[PDB]
């Protein structure tokens, strides 16, 4: 019962090779190429002092939250560059933040394993912690909301957990990853989510069934970023190998590799445009790159940062792209 | 032109900006220190002595200077994915137990490997390191009946403490491959109430003065 695993893996590889009738590049060879996509910094948001590590867009596509080592979360009005709230965190070592789909709650966490849920719509006016979820043995990596009561989290324990906020306890404990889980992404229907870890593999999970449905491989190093296609059928992953890889759940096979010989840096963030034609990945070489998801060719460069592109997000309407960096500045394109 | 509610929102935003600036001004006044060491290196002893499942923050003040320490030992996770968060620490406090030279995890070799991995890390090229040799009395007691050769094959000397500890510290300092940019403040952890914090304060003041001199170009 300890030798058949490699035979099963060989069978899976053969099955995946059988369906590899054609590559995406060959089929898409005839499409009209996107052309140079020039983007200019419409707004630059200042007020953070330390490094910015995470940001997220609200469902309204106007309010965004950003986290920094100042121990403070700032709710930003992108249209007017105004500050709506300043939430003083209990532990300054934050690494992730999230904005609830209804906009009522904000979540964050980091090297302190406790995940704190903040209530914005407080009758007394000031924001306060709604709950302090705990139970992860390692540092908290990524957080995303499913609704006002359910939040999915990933940590360095090699496990992802689904939390029920009302009771403040884990509803499910996803396990199976061999390395630290680096990022999370929720499917449009919220039925499934996919997580990437340091084991160079991406796993697809079922929120309600509670077991891994599919695992993907092909990266030679840690997977630091991941995001779904807006149709929910495919997802992209970023790794330190300077390579972005597009995966399809139904095909269960790698489709394209987005890398250039001049790129040696790692990748910290990945995001998609609403139509999915444009893939935006934040590289560590002081700028972000725009990749055509169907041509694999580079279409533009969002070079406006000085230290490191740390987080990246696209508005739910696709109107603008928000890029954060360790400069303590946020630029909206 | 802005509406009345818009003007009120702008006023609120400016007030938030002022509060953030004040908090940052408070934040810049206090030093940040990173504490590292093996599981049984004595981190608990030193942290408890100086104090007059994740990151643990300890706040204390000495001669009108605010000190806070970050204990990262509890994190049983890969270091390279979060060590960069501490790039701005003024100095790194490293604890190594002298008595572990004859205990198997070879724990001295593990401590040396961790020191090599942390001090040569690209994120800590400019940051100085304060090294504490813990449990000096136990090393005194046990060295005379257990030659140091059990750990270091190439040793050439007597078993007395005065030179055995010298050889240990020399080996620890020799691992520094960036001697020009950073310095290793070694010290021996003797039971006390004030001398440890005194040495830490001296090290940090000297380091900040050197950093300022380098910034102004005089060094």
């Amino acid at each position, epitope marked *: 019962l300890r030798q058949e695993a490699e035979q099963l893996k060989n069978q899976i590889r053969d099955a995946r090779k059988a369906c590899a009738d054609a590559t995406l590049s060959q089929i898409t060879n005839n499409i009209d190429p996107v052309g140079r996509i020039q983007m200019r910094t419409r707004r630059t948001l200042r007020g953070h002092l330390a490094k910015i590590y995470a940001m997220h867009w609200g469902t309204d596509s*106007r*309010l965004l939250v950003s986290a920094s080592q100042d121990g403070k979360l700032i709710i930003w*009005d992108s249209y007017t560059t*105004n500050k*709506v*709230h300043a939430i003083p965190l209990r532990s300054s070592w934050v690494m992730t933040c999230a904005y609830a789909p209804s*906009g009522n709650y904000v979540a964050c966490g980091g090297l302190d394993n406790i995940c704190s849920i903040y209530n914005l*719509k407080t*009758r*007394e*006016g*000031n924001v306060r912690v709604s709950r302090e979820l705990a139970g992860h043995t390692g540092y908290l990596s990524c957080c995303r909301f499913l609704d006002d009561n359910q939040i999915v989290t990933s940590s360095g324990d090699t496990t992802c957990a689904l939390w029920d906020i009302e009771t403040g306890q884990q509803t499910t404990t996803f396990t199976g990853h061999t390395g630290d889980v680096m990022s999370l992404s929720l499917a449009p229907d919220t039925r499934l989510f996919v997580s990437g870890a340091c084991d160079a593999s991406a796993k697809l999970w079922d929120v309600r069934e509670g077991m891994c449905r599919q695992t993907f491989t092909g990266h030679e190093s840690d997977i630091n970023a991941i995001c779904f296609f807006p149709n929910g059928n495919a997802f992209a992953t970023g790794s330190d190998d300077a390579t972005c890889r597009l995966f399809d759940l139904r095909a269960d096979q790698e489709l394209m590799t987005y890398s250039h010989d001049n790129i040696i840096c790692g990748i910290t963030s990945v995001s998609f445009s609403k139509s999915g034609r444009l893939l935006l990945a934040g590289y560590d070489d002081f700028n972000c790159n725009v990749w055509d998801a169907l041509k694999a060719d580079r279409a533009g460069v969002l070079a406006g940062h000085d230290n490191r592109v740390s987080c990246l997000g696209v508005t739910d309407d696709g109107m603008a792209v928000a890029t954060g960096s360790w400069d303590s500045f946020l630029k909206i394109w | 032109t802005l*509406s*009345a*509610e*818009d*003007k*009120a*929102a702008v*006023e*609120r935003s400016k*007030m938030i900006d002022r509060n953030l600036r004040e908090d940052g001004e408070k934040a810049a006044r206090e030093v940040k220190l990173l504490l590292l060491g093996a599981g049984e290196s004595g981190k608990n002893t030193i942290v408890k002595q100086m104090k007059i499942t994740g990151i643990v923050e300890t706040h204390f003040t000495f001669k009108d200077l605010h000190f806070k320490m970050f204990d990262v030992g509890a994190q049983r996770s890969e270091r390279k994915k979060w060590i960069h968060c501490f790039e701005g620490v003024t100095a790194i406090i490293f604890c190594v137990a002298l008595s572990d030279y004859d205990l198997v995890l070879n724990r001295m070799h593990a401590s040396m490997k961790l020191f090599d991995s942390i001090c040569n890390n690209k994120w800590f090229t400019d940051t100085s390191i304060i090294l504490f040799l813990n449990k000096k009395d136990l090393f005194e007691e046990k060295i005379k009946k257990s030659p140091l050769t059990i750990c270091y094959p190439e040793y050439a000397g007597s078993n007395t403490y005065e030179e055995a500890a010298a050889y240990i510290q020399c080996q620890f300092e020799d691992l520094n491959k960036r001697k020009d940019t950073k310095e290793i403040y070694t010290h021996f952890t003797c039971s006390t109430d004030t001398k440890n914090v005194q040495f830490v304060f001296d090290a940090v003041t000297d380091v900040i003065i050197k950093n300022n001199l380098k910034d102004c170009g005089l060094f």
Partner: single-chain antibody
Amino acid sequence: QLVESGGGLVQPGGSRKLSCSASGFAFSSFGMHWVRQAPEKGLEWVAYISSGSGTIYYADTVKGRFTISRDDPKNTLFLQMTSLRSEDTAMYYCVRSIYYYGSSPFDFWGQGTTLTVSSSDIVMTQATSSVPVTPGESVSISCRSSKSLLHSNGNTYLYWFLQRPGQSPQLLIYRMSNLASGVPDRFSGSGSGTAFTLTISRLEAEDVGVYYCMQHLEYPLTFGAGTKLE
């Protein structure tokens, strides 16, 4: 909660010191307004002070005469009155407000204090002064204003308030489309520029009262004459 104090009989031309104590919320972050109601007329704006005392406004009918000040440490709001006149006879309200994207100003109103003295603004009209209503019936209220309240940014700055007999006004609808927290879904609001209306579905108990409209496009803040439901 907010409670006012310092009322009573005052001779004309004198000075009286009004104050109120805030509790249960971050008084420092919230703006404050003073609104007064004559014994047999509608509401009227008096003064406003922003958070941190960074902005102060007064109504033209009380400019210079009245002074408004704040003291965050004791969470108390102050209003100095000097040289009182017969027109100042009215019962005063303290009104709570916070200004930010998605906020609901004028949400909370205090119990009020009564003061008795021995004896280019945007005009808004509510011609339908009174309406007889029956429980279970659906009723609508209309409003009008001189200057259009639809600002270029898309926000229509109008507020709806309801004052029950012997009770302080309660925020009902803000910005012409948003129901205030705790308001039943029965109430609704809609309307184009220079014309607004409010609808109530299946009116029921404790809905009788005077409904007040308010504009917030620019100071001074003007209140309507009120619509009484009986």
